[PDB]
Amino acid sequence: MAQFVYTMHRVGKVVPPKRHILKNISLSFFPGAKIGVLGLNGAGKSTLLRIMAGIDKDIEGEARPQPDIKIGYLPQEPQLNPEHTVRESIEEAVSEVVNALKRLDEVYALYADPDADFDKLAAEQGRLEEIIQAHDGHNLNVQLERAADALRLPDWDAKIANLSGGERRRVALCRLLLEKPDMLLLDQPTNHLDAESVAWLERFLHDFEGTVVAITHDRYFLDNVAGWILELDRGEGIPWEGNYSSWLEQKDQRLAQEASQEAARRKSIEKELEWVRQGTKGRQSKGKARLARFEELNSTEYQKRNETNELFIPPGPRLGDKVLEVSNLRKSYGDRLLIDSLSFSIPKGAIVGIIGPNGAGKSTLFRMISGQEQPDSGTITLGETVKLASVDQFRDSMDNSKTVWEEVSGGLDIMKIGNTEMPSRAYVGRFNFKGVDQGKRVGELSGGERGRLHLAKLLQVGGNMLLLDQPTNDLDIETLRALENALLEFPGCAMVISHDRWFLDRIATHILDYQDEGKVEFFEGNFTEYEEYKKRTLGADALEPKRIKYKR
RNA sequence: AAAAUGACA
RNA sequence: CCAUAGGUUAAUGAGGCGAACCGGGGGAACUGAAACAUCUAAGUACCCCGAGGAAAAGAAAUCAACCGAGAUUCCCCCAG
RNA sequence: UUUUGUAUAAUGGGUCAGCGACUUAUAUUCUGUAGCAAGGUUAACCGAAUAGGGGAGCCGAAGGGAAACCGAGUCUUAACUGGGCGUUAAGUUGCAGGGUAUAGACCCGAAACCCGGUGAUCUAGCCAUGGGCAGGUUGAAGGUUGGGUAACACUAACUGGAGGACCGAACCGACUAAUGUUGAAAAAUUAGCGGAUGACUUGUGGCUGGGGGUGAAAGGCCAAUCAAACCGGGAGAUAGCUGGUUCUCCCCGAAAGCUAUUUAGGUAGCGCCUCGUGAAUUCAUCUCCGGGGGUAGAGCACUGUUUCGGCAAGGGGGUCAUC
RNA sequence: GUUUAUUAAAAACACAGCACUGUGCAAACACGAAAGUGGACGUAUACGGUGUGACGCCUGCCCGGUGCCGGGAGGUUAAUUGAUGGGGUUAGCGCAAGCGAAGCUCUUGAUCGAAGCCCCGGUAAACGGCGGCCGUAACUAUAACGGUCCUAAGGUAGCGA
RNA sequence: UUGAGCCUUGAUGUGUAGGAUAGGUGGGAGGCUUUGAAGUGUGGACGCCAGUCUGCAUGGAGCCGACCUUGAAAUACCACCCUUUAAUGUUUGAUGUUCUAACGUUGACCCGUAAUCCGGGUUGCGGACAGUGUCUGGUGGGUAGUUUGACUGGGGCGGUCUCCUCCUAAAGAGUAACGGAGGAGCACGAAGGUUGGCUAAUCCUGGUCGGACAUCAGGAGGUUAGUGCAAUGGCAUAAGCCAGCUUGACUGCGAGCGUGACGGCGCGAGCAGGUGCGAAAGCAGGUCAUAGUGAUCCGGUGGUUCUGAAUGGAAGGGCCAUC
RNA sequence: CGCGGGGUUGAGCAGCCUGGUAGCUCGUCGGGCUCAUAACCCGAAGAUCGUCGGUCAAAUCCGGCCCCCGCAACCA
Ligand SMILES: Nc1ncnc2c1ncn2[C@@H]1O[C@H](COP(=O)(O)OP(=O)(O)OP(=O)(O)O)[C@@H](O)[C@H]1O
Ligand SMILES: Nc1ncnc2c1ncn2[C@@H]1O[C@H](COP(=O)(O)OP(=O)(O)OP(=O)(O)O)[C@@H](O)[C@H]1O
Ligand SMILES: [Mg+2]
Ligand SMILES: [Mg+2]
Ligand SMILES: [Mg+2]
Ligand SMILES: [Mg+2]
Ligand SMILES: [Mg+2]
Ligand SMILES: [Mg+2]
Ligand SMILES: [Mg+2]
Ligand SMILES: [Mg+2]
Ligand SMILES: [Mg+2]
Ligand SMILES: [Mg+2]
Ligand SMILES: [Mg+2]
Ligand SMILES: [Mg+2]
Ligand SMILES: [Mg+2]
Ligand SMILES: [Mg+2]
Ligand SMILES: [Mg+2]
Ligand SMILES: [Mg+2]
Ligand SMILES: [Mg+2]
Ligand SMILES: [Mg+2]
Ligand SMILES: [Mg+2]
Ligand SMILES: [Mg+2]
Ligand SMILES: [Mg+2]
Ligand SMILES: [Mg+2]
Ligand SMILES: [Mg+2]
Ligand SMILES: [Mg+2]
Ligand SMILES: [Mg+2]
Ligand SMILES: [Mg+2]
Ligand SMILES: [Mg+2]
Ligand SMILES: [Mg+2]
Ligand SMILES: [Mg+2]
Ligand SMILES: [Mg+2]
Ligand SMILES: [Mg+2]
Ligand SMILES: [Mg+2]
Ligand SMILES: [Mg+2]
Ligand SMILES: [Mg+2]
Ligand SMILES: [Mg+2]
Ligand SMILES: [Mg+2]
Ligand SMILES: [Mg+2]
Ligand SMILES: [Mg+2]
Ligand SMILES: [Mg+2]
Ligand SMILES: [Mg+2]
Ligand SMILES: [Mg+2]
Ligand SMILES: [Mg+2]
Ligand SMILES: [Mg+2]
Ligand code: NA
Ligand code: NA
Structure with a gap:
């Protein structure tokens, strides 16, 4: 009884093609409930989040929150100001209190003035004497000095342009959270965070009540916090109570049963078609009712929209022994040193996984490798046989006003990958972009579809020194395993x-581990062998967490 | 663990 | 001994019949809809119970419209 | 009579005489006639009553708009120089008539559905009771006495009298043929045929009732009637379907087409007929004038097809670098 | 032995025998608005239903469809229950405007909620079903044999113009 | 045995730096401590792991406030507790086991009674199940009511049913067959409106890769080109091709006509209010035209006090737009 | 001929599924293992997707031509 924070009733949704990404989803939520939303790229999870937060009301059905609840919505790709700084971007969040202090000091200026002393005050200041109290505008300074510690935000002077990818998400998380909301709707909240930040956030989420609906492709992240699982497969809402391991078997069972029913329906259709095509045998019935039943049996069902399979990677020029060695590399920004005295040499035919904290120079390394930057010391020595192909860390380089096919190919019926040409339509189709899904504008694309398309567009240079910068951005389990x-x-x-x-545990053959002081160390092997190295030359240190919290 | 066959003189 | 159930005993009443009309309990289908299933035929035919010279109904928890009328029953309009 | 069409070998009629089919309330529209006339007329009812009262009410004299509303105007519209509907031409009540509506609705005619009752004296099954089956055969189990065994088993003679057993009359049936089909008979006669101690047959009396009975099962039987008995009622069911429709004279006089249709043999609007009113040199023939055609015919520049020339691509079988 | 009384007496019906299935007794089942009767003054060696039809030798493979039996985890799931949001009215604050307490009403429908169905097994003397194309051996006559596709399984014994 | 709620008792709340696990206001202040310390073992939950709460060991008379070096201060009552939970009460819900008193008894005995019916009385056995009533989901040819189109060179099977183009079609319009051939159930915010500008297919000669055919140059050519999609009629003033600015793909009307049995469908100058393009004259109420479709009823969503059943409101209607 | 289905490597089959992407098992050819052959291992080849033709795009759509495989020919 009681409870019942949020409700959805027969909430359909129709997209321009014709299909219903959501149809007949009727369910309710309760205080202090954690729901994890699963599905595939295209299942409608982000649209459901937008509806639940209330951004779009173009539904059929009803979607009601209980009155007097604060909703914090974290979207797929939060948009900030490339002009702002961290200080003036975070300061926006607590807006009713900065103006409260400013106006209170101005009223402290104007109140001693004998002009309308009993008119300009009783009507104006009184509306602020509690805006400074309920929101507590006096102690925002210590509030921020404390809340900066937990996230370990970038420096205040830092600019959004100078900011790195993970720190940008950190800033956006602080901005969203500071409102102290009840409903917390997040779409993939841990896109760029490392082990420390992800563990911290998934502890804080589990502690924090008010109901949290989280989109996540990560089994381990979901297991800690989720008390309910929403499936959202093909326009249906399947609620599962349990953990990921128990739900995966039920999902597989459902697929197997649906395939078996499909086969049975096929065989029935063959059997009835034979009777339909048989003769007449005299002046007898032939059964108009039976004909109507057979005609009704010819229905349609949706194949799973993207059971995407192994992607396409066209290799290019032959490559020799020199694989762009690096000697005495040192990098810094002003005085902030990222890397000092780094020297290594990648072998031939290897995969090198790079690991480290947020804003530790990982993207900077690719930047200076691809010629965008310069090394403050030493030199990187390319091999003359080396072809470069580097994937940008951010999806935000496409133009949202163009079709998928046009964006990838360039408006050419035949483009070329590497040296051989092959048709552009086939080249895109190799990335599970069928002819129908060809026509959607790249601005109308899910996160995973956008990532796949951007990867497909950039991988057409036919190079052989693939500099992938987090291709596992918004990839499902099967999408990830294909690549x-x-x-x-x-x-x-x-x-x-x-x-x-x-992901790297299955593919990495060389390891680049970042550390403190700007220390980057090379290693040859996989992660189990890295653990073997640590255990052979060990050190007793496991006291990672402290749980700073936010409020006093 | 698997292992079939070889015209007459 | 309880006491009830019960069995003889007396007087008083009703049993059945009859044409129509009347009140009540049940209650069709053919037909029309140019087929038909909601609907109409129709609460009609028919069955059953009960009286009376008539029977039922009948003295506003009724209408009306800020003006008012005064139980029930039947006839002519309202009005197809 | 029905038809495109009948001497038709298509239907109906043996003949006379009698009977037999467009009617009767009410309502509405039009026509003729009669009375009053911007008015006309009453209903129920009262009444020594076809009179006289009764004007409740109905129609008409004003329309427009969905409505408020306005008003010889109104609606539309922000508004019409507009545009739709109206003003400017008399109605109402009887009588007679032609239509339409609700009633059986011009008359005769179904197979069928529903309701209440009468039927198991014929026939299905079953229940209680008591009769019938001439005559002649065959030899089961069993038993006794002998043989055989340690005992059995087995065996021989005698005896015995079983069976949906055998042949065959009464009795019960009904396989073949002939006769008879306005019969002797609304299922029989004649010569043959099957069972004939049994799951038999028969007398008397009971029980099962109509969407129900009973059925060694055929949709068989339930009073000569059964894929749902008979009698009465709803009931003059419905019939776009056949048949029939009664005295006389004068005038005019068609259609078998289009569109639509659960529609093709029905119906509805229009085209074709008749009666009445009002109107224009209204309409028809002919001569002259102003027109646009793309048919018949003709033709091959075009779309195609068709031969014969001289040119000429270009090409194919061999001969070739037989790259 | 029985049957279409009145055009069909039969290969049809019945039958003894066989099998499956239900039924623990106030039995299943049938006639009955019900009371109550038959079953039966019987009691699983009994009674009802269905198929086959003495006797002899036998009765092969398939649980995919459709029925029946068992399971209860999960999905769906009625009546009841009426939390919530929206709307109407208005005592008042205003006296232009608008807001709107308590009550009363119209609507919306949170939670709870069984059997069935989905799902998991069995069952064929339960209703039923029981394959294609191509090559191959001293006359190329045919295939003991092989290749491949499909099925729930590919017709066995015995018969066969 | 338990889910859930409620009320009271306990406990828990470690950013940085003051002192070191500290949630908020307190109200203000030293009082707590002695139902026997700060101190001496450790009980145990937890921890961010320094320890702070707490069972028991003798004695049993102790800490801080205040100063504040940080934003804030001193666990030293009680408050809705604001947070986790830990309990006992406590209401409700479920799942169980036990009982007797409703109820069943087609178990035994007794009486009415000279009665295997019925009733009553004792006694067992079940027992809040079973059973019945109302509501409700499933199943339900066991039973009942009906439907199952038309054209058609007889019916059935086959084909077809609405719209567009050509021919049949007889030089106005219309005109049939199960006659001869093809299409449609759309698309376009530009492929629409103006203002500027431009004009094709094919063939030849020359020329880098490059040829039979890509791009370039100049000659013949003269619409054999093109139209957003079938065919016919059109198109150079282009209705074809290329750009700018654009929204007339406007609202209310509409002289007068074409075609339909009707429902309806089509063409339309001009008038009023605003609008775009152009220097203006002017053009623009969709697309070169002809297919791209569905009446009424019922209901949904916006606007409008037109109406609002005693009155004021409201529900519900009406009208306009639309599904 | 009235109505349906089919045609893909040397054999049997997918892929026609709403067009951009020609595959499978056996078999042919060349090596290897073995005294030698089968089996087994390794490596290759080839298909105008029946045909005439008409969608940016087909094996895939549609019309026709060719051949093959089934079905129906009822009431008198
Ligand atoms: N205009 C459009 N036309 C066609 N498809 C569209 C259009 N707009 C959205 N879609 C489709 O609707 C779906 C929306 O999915 P959504 O944005 O919820 O992402 P998701 O794949 O469910 O989740 P996530 O990207 O967060 O992992 C996608 O499949 C997208 O392609
Ligand atoms: N132009 C710049 N000016 C100042 N600082 C910069 C600039 N570019 C990068 N940085 C800093 O360099 C550091 C590394 O940034 P980088 O882009 O390499 O991030 P990263 O390690 O790849 O992080 P992430 O997890 O977000 O991908 C960050 O601290 C960032 O703020
Ligand atoms: Mg009497
Ligand atoms: Mg009728
Ligand atoms: Mg009729
Ligand atoms: Mg009386
Ligand atoms: Mg005639
Ligand atoms: Mg004739
Ligand atoms: Mg003649
Ligand atoms: Mg004659
Ligand atoms: Mg004659
Ligand atoms: Mg005749
Ligand atoms: Mg005659
Ligand atoms: Mg009027
Ligand atoms: Mg009937
Ligand atoms: Mg008898
Ligand atoms: Mg005998
Ligand atoms: Mg007989
Ligand atoms: Mg005889
Ligand atoms: Mg005999
Ligand atoms: Mg005899
Ligand atoms: Mg008879
Ligand atoms: Mg009948
Ligand atoms: Mg009648
Ligand atoms: Mg009659
Ligand atoms: Mg004449
Ligand atoms: Mg007819
Ligand atoms: Mg000619
Ligand atoms: Mg016999
Ligand atoms: Mg007979
Ligand atoms: Mg006979
Ligand atoms: Mg009994
Ligand atoms: Mg048999
Ligand atoms: Mg259930
Ligand atoms: Mg029936
Ligand atoms: Mg009827
Ligand atoms: Mg017909
Ligand atoms: Mg003509
Ligand atoms: Mg003409
Ligand atoms: Mg155009
Ligand atoms: Mg121009
Ligand atoms: Mg134009
Ligand atoms: Mg056009
Ligand atoms: Mg009112
Ligand atoms: Mg309204
Ligand atoms: Na997303
Ligand atoms: Na980065």
């Missing part, structure tokens, strides 16, 4: 930057 199996077959060299060590 994970395609990469192991790459002839050329692959340098991969990522935060999820489980």
